[PDB]
Design a protein around this nucleic acid. Structure first.
Ligand SMILES: [Zn+2]
Ligand SMILES: [Zn+2]
Lengths: 166, 166
RNA sequence: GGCCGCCC
RNA sequence: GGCCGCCC
């Protein structure tokens, strides 16, 4: 019965307060909450874990580690979904700030964000389209694509070599 | 029916391969797996999150972040249990290495470690005693105690000020 | 922050 | 790596 006003929030690093993106760029992909703002990568450091995920999916590859570019806090993980690299920001690494309300809060779960702060809808085709080529516009961002491509390649090889048993 | 041989393992940083401690120093405290080797702190970087845990316990305080001192990977969290500061290492940040077997493995859960690698028993009084003054022997370690004491102080104040409502 | 269970 | 539930 208690509905929020679905305001716009800034999503900030809870360690150094740098802003990653606005709330309206969060979209879900089957319970995975991802950022579909192509500018977000500028604010993220991408680094290989040098270990393939134990969850081996073709559609939904958990790949490189993502850190705040400023302070290097671990803020989530990059995925490859439907051929597209996407940042998944951890809700516990964020602070949500609303300017007009003069309010700032943390939340323990993304479902708490949806309940208390702002609505989050399912990502659709245009969201994947706008993110597909987001990493080819800055030298820093091109180096990040190299990491992701390498992790994705090893992920695919691990899945192929396990399927060799079957 | 399939029993392991309960060998000694080195617990190493999965990012940089620095050794934190031996397996025989892991002990559990009510499903929390902690390190009771007083030398381990030398290998850990302690940093305030500057945010009190949402789990407010008198007996079991989750406190400062712990990182590998060498490579700064997030490897767990420090707790205060029974008046004692203890490192809790994340099982997913470790690689387990057994020299005589010539073997090295990751595990996804501490219960998998117990099932496949080595037994882990409940911590007892002498374990807390040996850890009580582990942070007063190096300049680096004394600075770590300052962080922990500050986080514990704010934790206690947060719990006291919430209990003010009741 | 942790444990275990289920699911992706 | 994530989701949700329970527990510490
Ligand atoms: Zn930051
Ligand atoms: Zn390390």
């Amino acid at each position: 019965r208690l509905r929020h006003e679905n305001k716009i929030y800034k999503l900030m690093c809870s360690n150094c307060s740098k802003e990653f993106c606005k709330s309206i760029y969060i979209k879900k992909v089957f319970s995975n909450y991802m950022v579909f703002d192509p500018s977000v990568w500028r604010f993220l450091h991408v680094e290989s874990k040098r270990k393939v995920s134990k969850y081996l999916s073709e559609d939904n590859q958990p790949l490189s580690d993502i850190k705040c570019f400023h302070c290097k806090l671990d803020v989530g993980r990059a995925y490859k979904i439907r051929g597209t690299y996407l940042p998944q920001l951890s809700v516990k690494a964020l602070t949500f700030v609303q300017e007009s309300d003069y309010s700032s809060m943390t939340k323990a779960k993304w479902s708490d964000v949806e309940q208390d702060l702002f609505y989050i809808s399912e990502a659709i085709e245009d969201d994947f389209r706008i993110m597909l080529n987001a990493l080819s516009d800055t030298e820093e961002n091109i180096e990040k694509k190299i990491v992701l491509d390498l992790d994705s390649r090893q992920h695919n090889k691990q899945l192929e070599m396990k399927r060799f048993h079957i």
